[PDB]
């Protein structure tokens, strides 16, 4: 603590006073991982490996929950043409949990395949499938041209070019109504200013990459609107109480201790917030319980020392630190110099029962100085001498002796 004073002040000498070198830290030991255990596997191969797919105007929605997935086919082993992600990192797919999954499978040409993204406008982008600006997910593409294509063209997959107004996102258009740009009624058939909006793709294997179809499955991720769907796949550890450790609970992190909860709980609730707007409580995924979270590493380290022209003895002060449980130094932790004050415990000063005039203040009425083979002592600040005179009505004191005193006051201008 002599060397910690010179680091913050950027001086090679130490002046006379009380300084704050650093703050009290608690290093975490283990990491509690509590993840749910499901014996079911997630059928991702139904939507990925199927022969027949839907079109861009009406797709097949899929909700997958209450299983255990494998994300290594999206990331680790990837024999795919183009894989992209936006909000969630592809490295971090094994970590996070989300609200629900929407698997949207459609077959799209290679010229129009770049319009699946937030903030796009085009033929396929406007009137079929839109994404909002806050949308989170990944785009997986693979070249399908050696399988479902045809030499004379594929008329099975269809798309819709024409619509009157802009379509709301996450909505399928089943309407067969003829687009009417004129004042003449179309009556369901072609005519003047009457076009049939539903057309067929140009797909052939023999031409370039604009005519090659791609298999695009877009996953929808929404964050913190609900508890966990599948889980992030990992291992699982035990549940440690009354010890400061790192937390990872369904992707949400934290540092603190786990204590019992006397407050009532909500059965639909994963976690909640205190008056400090941080997570004070969490629910176990496997069984339904609630435990309180109190954070760690609180308080500060202050030093009390005379200057370098006097001695090297440095007294250290913890403020707001519980001293029953106890910086890189272990050397003063043997004890027996510890005196308990209001602000904390003072290590390195011997408490005396006398009352003197001190120099370096601490607080709460208890001060400290350097007095006499000499050491730092701590005591209570003196009020001065005590004067006791008996008084009556018939006595007076008139001074018979005078002196002239000269005092000096300094005011900066």
């Amino acid at each position, epitope marked *: 603590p002599l060397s910690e004073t010179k680091c913050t002040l950027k001086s090679f000498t130490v002046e006379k006073g009380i300084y704050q070198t650093s703050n009290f830290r608690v290093q975490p030991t283990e990491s509690i991982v509590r993840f749910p255990n499901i014996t079911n596997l997630c059928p991702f191969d139904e939507v990925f490996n199927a022969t027949r797919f839907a079109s861009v105007y009406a797709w097949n929605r899929k909700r997958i929950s209450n299983c255990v997935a494998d994300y290594s086919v999206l990331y680790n082993l990837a024999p795919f043409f183009t894989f992209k992600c936006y909000g969630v990192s592809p490295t971090k797919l094994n970590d996070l949990c989300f609200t629900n999954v929407y698997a949207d499978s459609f077959v799209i040409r290679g010229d129009e395949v770049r319009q699946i993204a937030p903030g796009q406008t085009g033929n396929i982008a406007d009137y079929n499938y839109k994404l909002p600006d806050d949308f989170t997910g990944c785009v997986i593409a693979w070249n399908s041209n050696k399988l479902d294509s045809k030499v004379s063209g594929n008329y099975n997959y269809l798309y819709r070019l024409f619509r009157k107004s802009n379509l709301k996102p996450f909505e399928r258009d089943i309407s067969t109504e003829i687009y009417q740009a004129g004042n003449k009624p179309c009556n369901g058939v072609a005519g003047f200013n009457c076009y049939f909006p539903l057309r067929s793709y140009s797909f052939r294997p023999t031409y370039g990459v604009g005519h090659q179809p791609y298999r695009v499955v877009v996953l929808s991720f929404e964050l913190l609107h609900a508890p966990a769907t599948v889980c992030g796949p990992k291992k699982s550890t*035990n549940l440690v109480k009354n*010890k400061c450790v790192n937390f990872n609970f369904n992707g949400l992190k934290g540092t603190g201790v786990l204590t*019992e*909860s006397n407050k009532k*709980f909500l059965p639909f609730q994963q976690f909640g917030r205190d008056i400090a707007d941080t997570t004070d409580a969490v629910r176990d995924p496997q*069984t339904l319980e609630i435990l309180d979270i109190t954070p760690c590493s609180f308080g500060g380290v202050s030093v009390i020392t005379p200057g370098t022209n006097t001695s090297n003895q440095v007294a250290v002060l913890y403020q707001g630190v519980n001293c029953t449980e106890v910086p890189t130094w272990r050397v003063y932790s043997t004890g027996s110099n510890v005196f308990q004050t209001r602000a904390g415990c003072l290590i390195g000063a011997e408490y005396v029962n006398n009352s003197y005039e001190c120099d370096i203040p601490i607080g709460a009425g208890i001060c400290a100085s350097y007095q006499t083979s000499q050491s730092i002592i701590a005591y209570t600040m003196s009020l001065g001498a005590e004067n006791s005179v008996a008084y009556s009505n018939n006595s007076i004191a008139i001074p018979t002796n005078f002196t002239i005193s000269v005092t000096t006051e300094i005011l900066p201008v």
Partner: antibody
Amino acid sequence: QVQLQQPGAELVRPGASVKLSCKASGYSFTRFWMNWVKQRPGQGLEWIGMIHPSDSETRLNQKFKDKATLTVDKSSTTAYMQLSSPTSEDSAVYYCARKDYDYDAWFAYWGQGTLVTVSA
Amino acid sequence: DIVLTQSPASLAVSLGQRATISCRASKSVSASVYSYMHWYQQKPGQPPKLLIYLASSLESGVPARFSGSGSGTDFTLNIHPVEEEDAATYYCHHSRELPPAFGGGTKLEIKR
């Protein structure tokens, strides 16, 4: 199979040091905490101390302060308990247990038992 | 802390009856809707064994004649039907507050 092993008997003089052994097998030693209990005949069970083996931090009873010293060995996966200056009332039957966690923490398994006789 | 005291010290129950042995608590062990209590049964020459956790539940491998109930500071361990292998000392334990304490204990006898 998880089984905790202890020696049967240990002879120690009063005023000397007491060293005991609890061998852990079948589980990770730094993952699960260890507990030491004390059983005198006719009195029942009394609780000595509990130690986190990874941090080497001890939790002791108020009456049992400075009599017992808890230390661990993570290389051999063997927990130790060091008693200082035993008396005639300190001779008892000692167990060690594995503390498993599911909300309220139970004691899943137990050791073979150790009878410590203090005499010269 | 929480001091557990069981009454009486010894109880002799004949075969076929119901044994009522209570573990009384000085403070409330109920928090989060679930109380913190365990039950131990110690045969002589052997370490004690775990029976009932959280009270409302029963450990697998323990037979169905060992049951318990109660809420708050008043718990009740009901032993029925009484068999000759059930004579042993009964204990109760709270893990809630540090430092943990142990109960006084109650030994069950067979009246023949």
